């Protein structure tokens, strides 16, 4: 019920860039066996979108870390807020695919 | 600066979020064609739920139309209008 999205607008907006992505903590820290987390996932700036070439892929060229207060839970025993670090993608580029 | 626990909780909790969706994934029958851009930005359910017994799902949907370059490789191209599904409202619901 909006107007039609114009081709150039879609092209520019979807082209390879850092986008807020909802990343599962256990995916980033797979060695955890002691705890479960609250929230179970975090919002992170990560490379997303398209390169419109088969010989290209969307990759990070500048990275940093972000610290978040996460509830660390030992099921049926206890809980405490801890500080957890995560990787963020600051700059993205379409680069020749890893053959 | 450290992101405060309540801020992370509210921001990651299950909701419609702009997601970069591959066109061929939404239209798997258009094998012969290639699209420019190859993907589109769509409001889709994302994020997490309270626990493992719950899943994040759409409870209100709509459509969006976008001008997409439709390409027949080595033959021709033209801008066409393509429709896509959007998720307007999300809920944490007991797993299927």
């Amino acid at each position, epitope marked *: 019920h909006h107007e039609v999205v114009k081709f150039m607008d879609v092209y520019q907006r979807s082209y390879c860039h850092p986008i807020e992505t909802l990343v599962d903590i256990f995916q980033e820290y797979p060695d955890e066996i002691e705890y479960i987390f*609250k929230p179970s996932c975090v919002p992170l700036m990560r490379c997303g979108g398209c390169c419109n070439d088969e010989g290209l892929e969307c990759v990070p060229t500048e990275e940093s870390n972000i610290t978040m207060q996460i*509830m660390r*839970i*030992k*099921p*049926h*025993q*206890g*809980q*405490h*807020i801890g500080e957890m670090s995560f990787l963020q993608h600051n700059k993205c580029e379409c680069r020749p695919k890893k053959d | 600066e450290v992101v405060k*626990f*309540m801020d992370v*909780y*509210q921001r990651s*909790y299950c909701h419609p979020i702009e997601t970069l969706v591959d066109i061929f994934q939404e239209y798997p029958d258009e094998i012969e064609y290639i699209f420019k851009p190859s993907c589109v930005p769509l409001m889709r359910c994302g994020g997490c739920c*309270n*626990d493992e*017994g*719950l899943e994040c799902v759409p409870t209100e949907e709509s459509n969006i139309t976008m001008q997409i370059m439709r390409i027949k490789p080595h033959q021709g191209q033209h801008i066409g209008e393509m429709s896509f599904l959007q998720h307007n409202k999300c809920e*944490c619901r*007991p797993k299927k």
Partner: antibody
Amino acid sequence: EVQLVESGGGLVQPGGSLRLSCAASGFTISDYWIHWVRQAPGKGLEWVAGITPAGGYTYYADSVKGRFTISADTSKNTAYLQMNSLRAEDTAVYYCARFVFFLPYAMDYWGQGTLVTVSS
Amino acid sequence: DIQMTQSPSSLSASVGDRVTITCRASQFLSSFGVAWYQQKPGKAPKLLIYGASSLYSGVPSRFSGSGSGTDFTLTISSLQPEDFATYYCQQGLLSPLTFGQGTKVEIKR
């Protein structure tokens, strides 16, 4: 020993304001969500206020929605329930309870309770 | 607002008796958002069962909880004089969090 200790109750004139304090000890109040539960004389338990798991924001009972506000002082390890525009139906024993995740969505430790009397 | 309806509203049984309180939900609830509490007169409630079937540490073994979907139950396998109290069920997942009406347990001697 984990303890929740309430204070700030007593007699209030109709249309008055009152602030209930919930003092934690044996734990850090920032590691949990403090919920408020009330019991009107002779009546059952009524859930009043608290940060909720489905979304993460502060919900209130329809009767108290718009006149009640919860808050916390992290340095004082204390939660508060500010009750304004008080009415007869708010006459009850008010409890504060520790809403927990490790025993999912349960209140394991409760305050002793405090009676609020809305009377002229 | 999900409604929690307990049955019976108030019962009465003998010491040694097996008694069961029922809590009926107005809609389907995943059995991990359901809690059972015991309340002695003029005293703060005490947690008995969490996640419909998990017995809280230090609570006597006679207490057990069960159910799924809309029907949840609390069983006292061997009723004791100290078991005189009002029992409440509570749903803590969906907003607003809500308590049942209560079931008064009285002892018969």
